[PDB]
């Protein structure tokens, strides 16, 4: 398969935004998140990666708007942000998204996350936010957690290097290679993508287990177009 591209739309206070290092308050705003999602779809996106950052940070939420965006997509939607308990998981699933991501929940409430995995299967992926080998949440050892989540039947991982997120300095390819070497489950790369060369490098890791790549600031800051990105990961 080709590398899947998941252009991102992160929502804060009803706006499309990008963060640096995932830090609340580092937002750059780009306007309407609905218009952004529809633009990605129009350019040929197969996936939207949609994030409710208010829910992630515990500052209210954008539930109605996230539901509207998801419903406006004819393409697959991965939804993330603050999915930490039965009600936030139910709200997310009710958007009709293709899959959700659990992040902090895997660290803070591992038994709840295991139960969600058992009950929803591959509608769940787990986000791993990494610095070095340490997991972070809004702690844990990367390989111990990966091993535990594997044994619990986790279908898929979304791996973010926090130090690269929103920085346009390139992805952490070594991190990604070694997570792929540790689990047989598909890995989605997130954070740092800055150039078409970065995408070529990620595409070369598909045989090792990199299934897809979430692309954020490179698209909003026009490092390349989504059309270029889709061409480059094609054969």
PDB file of C-alpha atoms in Angstrom:
ATOM      1  CA  UNK A   1       0.000   0.000   0.000  1.00  0.00           C
ATOM      2  CA  UNK A   2       0.904   3.657  -0.397  1.00  0.00           C
ATOM      3  CA  UNK A   3       1.472   5.787   2.667  1.00  0.00           C
ATOM      4  CA  UNK A   4      -1.886   7.130   3.847  1.00  0.00           C
ATOM      5  CA  UNK A   5      -2.068  10.895   4.335  1.00  0.00           C
ATOM      6  CA  UNK A   6      -4.206  12.358   7.103  1.00  0.00           C
ATOM      7  CA  UNK A   7      -4.331  16.094   6.808  1.00  0.00           C
ATOM      8  CA  UNK A   8      -5.157  17.588  10.208  1.00  0.00           C
ATOM      9  CA  UNK A   9      -7.768  19.976  11.470  1.00  0.00           C
ATOM     10  CA  UNK A  10      -7.285  20.924  15.132  1.00  0.00           C
ATOM     11  CA  UNK A  11     -10.080  22.978  16.692  1.00  0.00           C
ATOM     12  CA  UNK A  12      -9.820  25.547  19.479  1.00  0.00           C
ATOM     13  CA  UNK A  13     -12.613  28.034  20.215  1.00  0.00           C
ATOM     14  CA  UNK A  14     -14.227  27.077  16.908  1.00  0.00           C
ATOM     15  CA  UNK A  15     -11.131  27.916  14.876  1.00  0.00           C
ATOM     16  CA  UNK A  16      -8.663  25.837  12.916  1.00  0.00           C
ATOM     17  CA  UNK A  17      -5.355  26.086  14.787  1.00  0.00           C
ATOM     18  CA  UNK A  18      -1.903  24.610  15.026  1.00  0.00           C
ATOM     19  CA  UNK A  19       0.145  24.247  18.255  1.00  0.00           C
ATOM     20  CA  UNK A  20       3.876  24.066  19.007  1.00  0.00           C
ATOM     21  CA  UNK A  21       4.939  21.099  21.173  1.00  0.00           C
ATOM     22  CA  UNK A  22       1.262  20.528  21.951  1.00  0.00           C
ATOM     23  CA  UNK A  23       1.250  23.459  24.355  1.00  0.00           C
ATOM     24  CA  UNK A  24      -1.996  25.233  25.190  1.00  0.00           C
ATOM     25  CA  UNK A  25      -1.632  28.891  24.269  1.00  0.00           C
ATOM     26  CA  UNK A  26       0.763  28.315  21.350  1.00  0.00           C
ATOM     27  CA  UNK A  27      -2.079  28.367  18.821  1.00  0.00           C
ATOM     28  CA  UNK A  28      -1.663  29.880  15.367  1.00  0.00           C
ATOM     29  CA  UNK A  29      -5.163  30.348  13.855  1.00  0.00           C
ATOM     30  CA  UNK A  30      -6.081  29.696  10.216  1.00  0.00           C
ATOM     31  CA  UNK A  31      -9.821  30.348  10.114  1.00  0.00           C
ATOM     32  CA  UNK A  32     -12.692  27.964   9.604  1.00  0.00           C
ATOM     33  CA  UNK A  33     -12.101  24.309  10.454  1.00  0.00           C
ATOM     34  CA  UNK A  34     -15.025  23.290   8.274  1.00  0.00           C
ATOM     35  CA  UNK A  35     -13.688  25.141   5.257  1.00  0.00           C
ATOM     36  CA  UNK A  36     -10.255  23.624   5.907  1.00  0.00           C
ATOM     37  CA  UNK A  37     -11.584  20.063   6.079  1.00  0.00           C
ATOM     38  CA  UNK A  38     -13.589  20.545   2.871  1.00  0.00           C
ATOM     39  CA  UNK A  39     -10.509  21.943   1.110  1.00  0.00           C
ATOM     40  CA  UNK A  40      -8.476  18.861   2.059  1.00  0.00           C
ATOM     41  CA  UNK A  41     -11.314  16.624   0.834  1.00  0.00           C
ATOM     42  CA  UNK A  42     -11.573  18.559  -2.431  1.00  0.00           C
ATOM     43  CA  UNK A  43      -7.834  18.155  -3.081  1.00  0.00           C
ATOM     44  CA  UNK A  44      -8.172  14.369  -2.759  1.00  0.00           C
ATOM     45  CA  UNK A  45      -7.700  13.557   0.948  1.00  0.00           C
ATOM     46  CA  UNK A  46      -8.771  10.021   1.866  1.00  0.00           C
ATOM     47  CA  UNK A  47      -8.639  10.846   5.579  1.00  0.00           C
ATOM     48  CA  UNK A  48      -9.253  13.761   7.891  1.00  0.00           C
ATOM     49  CA  UNK A  49      -7.480  13.825  11.279  1.00  0.00           C
ATOM     50  CA  UNK A  50      -9.816  15.957  13.414  1.00  0.00           C
ATOM     51  CA  UNK A  51      -8.865  17.120  16.917  1.00  0.00           C
ATOM     52  CA  UNK A  52     -10.958  18.886  19.565  1.00  0.00           C
ATOM     53  CA  UNK A  53      -8.256  20.719  21.487  1.00  0.00           C
ATOM     54  CA  UNK A  54     -10.698  22.280  23.928  1.00  0.00           C
ATOM     55  CA  UNK A  55     -11.803  18.819  24.966  1.00  0.00           C
ATOM     56  CA  UNK A  56      -8.107  17.758  25.113  1.00  0.00           C
ATOM     57  CA  UNK A  57      -7.236  20.660  27.420  1.00  0.00           C
ATOM     58  CA  UNK A  58     -10.456  20.487  29.425  1.00  0.00           C
ATOM     59  CA  UNK A  59     -11.635  23.954  28.410  1.00  0.00           C
ATOM     60  CA  UNK A  60     -15.133  23.133  27.231  1.00  0.00           C
ATOM     61  CA  UNK A  61     -15.397  21.448  23.863  1.00  0.00           C
ATOM     62  CA  UNK A  62     -16.364  21.822  20.231  1.00  0.00           C
ATOM     63  CA  UNK A  63     -18.696  18.823  20.085  1.00  0.00           C
ATOM     64  CA  UNK A  64     -21.411  20.228  17.790  1.00  0.00           C
ATOM     65  CA  UNK A  65     -18.850  21.600  15.362  1.00  0.00           C
ATOM     66  CA  UNK A  66     -16.800  18.408  15.341  1.00  0.00           C
ATOM     67  CA  UNK A  67     -20.026  16.491  14.618  1.00  0.00           C
ATOM     68  CA  UNK A  68     -20.832  18.915  11.796  1.00  0.00           C
ATOM     69  CA  UNK A  69     -17.388  18.587  10.229  1.00  0.00           C
ATOM     70  CA  UNK A  70     -17.419  14.807  10.470  1.00  0.00           C
ATOM     71  CA  UNK A  71     -20.866  14.610   8.904  1.00  0.00           C
ATOM     72  CA  UNK A  72     -19.775  16.873   6.074  1.00  0.00           C
ATOM     73  CA  UNK A  73     -16.989  14.457   5.117  1.00  0.00           C
ATOM     74  CA  UNK A  74     -17.475  11.845   2.431  1.00  0.00           C
ATOM     75  CA  UNK A  75     -14.022  10.542   3.388  1.00  0.00           C
ATOM     76  CA  UNK A  76     -12.705   8.678   6.467  1.00  0.00           C
ATOM     77  CA  UNK A  77     -12.386  10.648   9.731  1.00  0.00           C
ATOM     78  CA  UNK A  78     -10.092   9.959  12.689  1.00  0.00           C
ATOM     79  CA  UNK A  79     -11.268  11.938  15.715  1.00  0.00           C
ATOM     80  CA  UNK A  80      -9.175  12.779  18.770  1.00  0.00           C
ATOM     81  CA  UNK A  81      -9.149  15.003  21.827  1.00  0.00           C
ATOM     82  CA  UNK A  82     -10.173  14.458  25.429  1.00  0.00           C
ATOM     83  CA  UNK A  83     -11.567  10.975  24.837  1.00  0.00           C
ATOM     84  CA  UNK A  84     -11.140   9.822  28.410  1.00  0.00           C
ATOM     85  CA  UNK A  85     -14.391   8.379  29.719  1.00  0.00           C
ATOM     86  CA  UNK A  86     -17.630   6.711  28.587  1.00  0.00           C
ATOM     87  CA  UNK A  87     -19.390   9.951  27.731  1.00  0.00           C
ATOM     88  CA  UNK A  88     -16.594  11.536  25.713  1.00  0.00           C
ATOM     89  CA  UNK A  89     -16.077   8.228  23.886  1.00  0.00           C
ATOM     90  CA  UNK A  90     -19.827   7.976  23.176  1.00  0.00           C
ATOM     91  CA  UNK A  91     -19.897  11.559  21.908  1.00  0.00           C
ATOM     92  CA  UNK A  92     -16.999  10.900  19.581  1.00  0.00           C
ATOM     93  CA  UNK A  93     -18.401   7.655  18.209  1.00  0.00           C
ATOM     94  CA  UNK A  94     -21.774   9.303  17.627  1.00  0.00           C
ATOM     95  CA  UNK A  95     -20.174  11.666  15.062  1.00  0.00           C
ATOM     96  CA  UNK A  96     -19.929   8.632  12.809  1.00  0.00           C
ATOM     97  CA  UNK A  97     -16.149   8.933  12.592  1.00  0.00           C
ATOM     98  CA  UNK A  98     -14.186   5.995  11.214  1.00  0.00           C
ATOM     99  CA  UNK A  99     -11.993   5.670  14.310  1.00  0.00           C
ATOM    100  CA  UNK A 100     -11.053   7.586  17.425  1.00  0.00           C
ATOM    101  CA  UNK A 101      -7.785   8.091  19.262  1.00  0.00           C
ATOM    102  CA  UNK A 102      -7.264   7.589  22.990  1.00  0.00           C
ATOM    103  CA  UNK A 103      -4.234   9.415  24.389  1.00  0.00           C
ATOM    104  CA  UNK A 104      -3.988  10.389  28.072  1.00  0.00           C
ATOM    105  CA  UNK A 105      -6.595   7.720  28.910  1.00  0.00           C
ATOM    106  CA  UNK A 106      -4.085   4.955  28.136  1.00  0.00           C
ATOM    107  CA  UNK A 107      -1.741   6.392  30.719  1.00  0.00           C
ATOM    108  CA  UNK A 108      -4.085   7.543  33.416  1.00  0.00           C
ATOM    109  CA  UNK A 109      -6.827   4.884  33.195  1.00  0.00           C
ATOM    110  CA  UNK A 110      -5.277   1.846  31.512  1.00  0.00           C
ATOM    111  CA  UNK A 111      -8.074  -0.512  32.496  1.00  0.00           C
ATOM    112  CA  UNK A 112     -10.686   1.793  31.022  1.00  0.00           C
ATOM    113  CA  UNK A 113      -8.666   2.044  27.814  1.00  0.00           C
ATOM    114  CA  UNK A 114      -8.253  -1.743  27.657  1.00  0.00           C
ATOM    115  CA  UNK A 115     -12.000  -2.119  28.031  1.00  0.00           C
ATOM    116  CA  UNK A 116     -12.610   0.379  25.213  1.00  0.00           C
ATOM    117  CA  UNK A 117     -10.259  -1.590  22.984  1.00  0.00           C
ATOM    118  CA  UNK A 118     -12.027  -4.846  23.857  1.00  0.00           C
ATOM    119  CA  UNK A 119     -15.469  -3.375  23.166  1.00  0.00           C
ATOM    120  CA  UNK A 120     -14.739  -1.278  20.026  1.00  0.00           C
ATOM    121  CA  UNK A 121     -11.805  -3.064  18.363  1.00  0.00           C
ATOM    122  CA  UNK A 122     -10.244  -1.235  15.469  1.00  0.00           C
ATOM    123  CA  UNK A 123     -12.523   1.813  15.900  1.00  0.00           C
ATOM    124  CA  UNK A 124      -9.853   2.599  18.557  1.00  0.00           C
ATOM    125  CA  UNK A 125      -6.248   3.630  18.027  1.00  0.00           C
ATOM    126  CA  UNK A 126      -3.974   4.780  20.847  1.00  0.00           C
ATOM    127  CA  UNK A 127      -1.979   8.005  20.628  1.00  0.00           C
ATOM    128  CA  UNK A 128       1.498   7.836  22.087  1.00  0.00           C
ATOM    129  CA  UNK A 129       3.030  11.260  22.765  1.00  0.00           C
ATOM    130  CA  UNK A 130       6.744  10.718  23.241  1.00  0.00           C
ATOM    131  CA  UNK A 131       9.792  12.519  24.508  1.00  0.00           C
ATOM    132  CA  UNK A 132      12.792  10.198  24.247  1.00  0.00           C
ATOM    133  CA  UNK A 133      11.241   7.011  25.619  1.00  0.00           C
ATOM    134  CA  UNK A 134       8.891   8.708  28.050  1.00  0.00           C
ATOM    135  CA  UNK A 135       5.161   9.024  27.376  1.00  0.00           C
ATOM    136  CA  UNK A 136       3.385  12.298  28.203  1.00  0.00           C
ATOM    137  CA  UNK A 137      -0.229  13.111  28.992  1.00  0.00           C
ATOM    138  CA  UNK A 138      -2.448  16.110  29.588  1.00  0.00           C
ATOM    139  CA  UNK A 139       3.796   9.385  32.392  1.00  0.00           C
ATOM    140  CA  UNK A 140       4.937   5.935  31.204  1.00  0.00           C
ATOM    141  CA  UNK A 141       7.724   3.899  29.542  1.00  0.00           C
ATOM    142  CA  UNK A 142       7.287   3.688  25.791  1.00  0.00           C
ATOM    143  CA  UNK A 143       8.147   0.028  25.295  1.00  0.00           C
ATOM    144  CA  UNK A 144       6.448  -1.234  28.442  1.00  0.00           C
ATOM    145  CA  UNK A 145       3.248   0.582  27.455  1.00  0.00           C
ATOM    146  CA  UNK A 146       3.439  -0.613  23.866  1.00  0.00           C
ATOM    147  CA  UNK A 147       3.860  -4.175  25.080  1.00  0.00           C
ATOM    148  CA  UNK A 148       0.846  -3.854  27.435  1.00  0.00           C
ATOM    149  CA  UNK A 149      -1.342  -2.293  24.761  1.00  0.00           C
ATOM    150  CA  UNK A 150      -0.329  -4.987  22.263  1.00  0.00           C
ATOM    151  CA  UNK A 151      -1.390  -7.695  24.695  1.00  0.00           C
ATOM    152  CA  UNK A 152      -4.690  -5.912  25.211  1.00  0.00           C
ATOM    153  CA  UNK A 153      -5.353  -6.137  21.489  1.00  0.00           C
ATOM    154  CA  UNK A 154      -4.750  -2.528  20.510  1.00  0.00           C
ATOM    155  CA  UNK A 155      -5.249  -2.263  16.726  1.00  0.00           C
ATOM    156  CA  UNK A 156      -3.131   0.756  15.871  1.00  0.00           C
ATOM    157  CA  UNK A 157      -0.865   3.495  17.292  1.00  0.00           C
ATOM    158  CA  UNK A 158      -0.513   7.181  16.477  1.00  0.00           C
ATOM    159  CA  UNK A 159       3.030   8.157  17.414  1.00  0.00           C
ATOM    160  CA  UNK A 160       3.843  11.848  18.056  1.00  0.00           C
ATOM    161  CA  UNK A 161       7.297  13.180  18.982  1.00  0.00           C
ATOM    162  CA  UNK A 162       6.267  16.116  21.176  1.00  0.00           C
ATOM    163  CA  UNK A 163       9.559  17.867  20.565  1.00  0.00           C
ATOM    164  CA  UNK A 164       8.810  17.925  16.805  1.00  0.00           C
ATOM    165  CA  UNK A 165       5.087  18.833  16.895  1.00  0.00           C
ATOM    166  CA  UNK A 166       4.326  22.090  15.105  1.00  0.00           C
ATOM    167  CA  UNK A 167       8.002  22.925  14.588  1.00  0.00           C
ATOM    168  CA  UNK A 168       8.530  22.276  10.863  1.00  0.00           C
ATOM    169  CA  UNK A 169      11.937  20.699  11.679  1.00  0.00           C
ATOM    170  CA  UNK A 170      11.134  17.205  10.266  1.00  0.00           C
ATOM    171  CA  UNK A 171       9.694  13.979  11.747  1.00  0.00           C
ATOM    172  CA  UNK A 172      11.576  11.786  14.205  1.00  0.00           C
ATOM    173  CA  UNK A 173      12.256   8.881  11.871  1.00  0.00           C
ATOM    174  CA  UNK A 174      14.358   6.974  14.425  1.00  0.00           C
ATOM    175  CA  UNK A 175      11.521   6.997  16.970  1.00  0.00           C
ATOM    176  CA  UNK A 176       9.126   5.751  14.329  1.00  0.00           C
ATOM    177  CA  UNK A 177      11.479   2.957  13.106  1.00  0.00           C
ATOM    178  CA  UNK A 178      11.900   1.635  16.608  1.00  0.00           C
ATOM    179  CA  UNK A 179       8.220   1.699  17.524  1.00  0.00           C
ATOM    180  CA  UNK A 180       7.616  -0.245  14.284  1.00  0.00           C
ATOM    181  CA  UNK A 181      10.328  -2.687  15.295  1.00  0.00           C
ATOM    182  CA  UNK A 182       8.617  -3.230  18.688  1.00  0.00           C
ATOM    183  CA  UNK A 183       4.995  -3.784  17.556  1.00  0.00           C
ATOM    184  CA  UNK A 184       3.388  -5.542  14.583  1.00  0.00           C
ATOM    185  CA  UNK A 185       0.373  -3.159  14.694  1.00  0.00           C
ATOM    186  CA  UNK A 186       0.157  -0.304  12.159  1.00  0.00           C
ATOM    187  CA  UNK A 187       1.799   2.975  13.158  1.00  0.00           C
ATOM    188  CA  UNK A 188       0.619   6.404  12.100  1.00  0.00           C
ATOM    189  CA  UNK A 189       3.354   9.093  12.120  1.00  0.00           C
ATOM    190  CA  UNK A 190       2.458  12.473  13.576  1.00  0.00           C
ATOM    191  CA  UNK A 191       4.412  15.678  14.022  1.00  0.00           C
ATOM    192  CA  UNK A 192       7.210  17.631  12.462  1.00  0.00           C
ATOM    193  CA  UNK A 193       6.513  17.016   8.759  1.00  0.00           C
ATOM    194  CA  UNK A 194       8.027  19.986   6.929  1.00  0.00           C
ATOM    195  CA  UNK A 195       8.652  19.021   3.344  1.00  0.00           C
ATOM    196  CA  UNK A 196       7.944  16.646   0.504  1.00  0.00           C
ATOM    197  CA  UNK A 197      11.289  14.993   1.271  1.00  0.00           C
ATOM    198  CA  UNK A 198       9.923  14.205   4.740  1.00  0.00           C
ATOM    199  CA  UNK A 199       6.997  12.448   3.139  1.00  0.00           C
ATOM    200  CA  UNK A 200       9.310  10.453   0.857  1.00  0.00           C
ATOM    201  CA  UNK A 201      11.238   9.367   3.940  1.00  0.00           C
ATOM    202  CA  UNK A 202       8.036   8.287   5.674  1.00  0.00           C
ATOM    203  CA  UNK A 203       6.809   6.502   2.551  1.00  0.00           C
ATOM    204  CA  UNK A 204      10.015   4.467   2.595  1.00  0.00           C
ATOM    205  CA  UNK A 205       9.058   3.151   6.034  1.00  0.00           C
ATOM    206  CA  UNK A 206       5.735   1.684   4.907  1.00  0.00           C
ATOM    207  CA  UNK A 207       7.287  -1.830   4.626  1.00  0.00           C
ATOM    208  CA  UNK A 208       8.481  -1.550   8.240  1.00  0.00           C
ATOM    209  CA  UNK A 209       5.000  -0.697   9.491  1.00  0.00           C
ATOM    210  CA  UNK A 210       4.346   3.006   9.008  1.00  0.00           C
ATOM    211  CA  UNK A 211       0.792   2.985   7.656  1.00  0.00           C
ATOM    212  CA  UNK A 212       0.114   6.698   7.418  1.00  0.00           C
ATOM    213  CA  UNK A 213       1.169  10.215   8.292  1.00  0.00           C
ATOM    214  CA  UNK A 214      -0.742  13.051   9.913  1.00  0.00           C
ATOM    215  CA  UNK A 215       0.177  16.355   8.273  1.00  0.00           C
ATOM    216  CA  UNK A 216      -0.525  19.654  10.037  1.00  0.00           C
ATOM    217  CA  UNK A 217       1.473  22.872   9.842  1.00  0.00           C
ATOM    218  CA  UNK A 218       3.270  22.068   6.552  1.00  0.00           C
ATOM    219  CA  UNK A 219      -0.101  22.319   4.784  1.00  0.00           C
ATOM    220  CA  UNK A 220      -1.414  25.421   6.627  1.00  0.00           C
ATOM    221  CA  UNK A 221       1.920  27.245   6.210  1.00  0.00           C
ATOM    222  CA  UNK A 222       2.096  26.207   2.569  1.00  0.00           C
ATOM    223  CA  UNK A 223       5.364  24.293   2.619  1.00  0.00           C
ATOM    224  CA  UNK A 224       3.635  22.129   0.034  1.00  0.00           C
ATOM    225  CA  UNK A 225       0.155  21.481  -1.265  1.00  0.00           C
ATOM    226  CA  UNK A 226      -1.935  18.429  -0.467  1.00  0.00           C
ATOM    227  CA  UNK A 227      -1.952  17.739  -4.229  1.00  0.00           C
ATOM    228  CA  UNK A 228       1.878  17.612  -4.222  1.00  0.00           C
ATOM    229  CA  UNK A 229       1.827  15.406  -1.133  1.00  0.00           C
ATOM    230  CA  UNK A 230      -0.571  12.889  -2.673  1.00  0.00           C
ATOM    231  CA  UNK A 231       1.494  12.754  -5.896  1.00  0.00           C
ATOM    232  CA  UNK A 232       4.741  12.239  -4.009  1.00  0.00           C
ATOM    233  CA  UNK A 233       3.532   9.224  -2.009  1.00  0.00           C
ATOM    234  CA  UNK A 234       2.118   7.667  -5.204  1.00  0.00           C
ATOM    235  CA  UNK A 235       4.221   5.250  -7.179  1.00  0.00           C
TER     236      UNK A 235
END
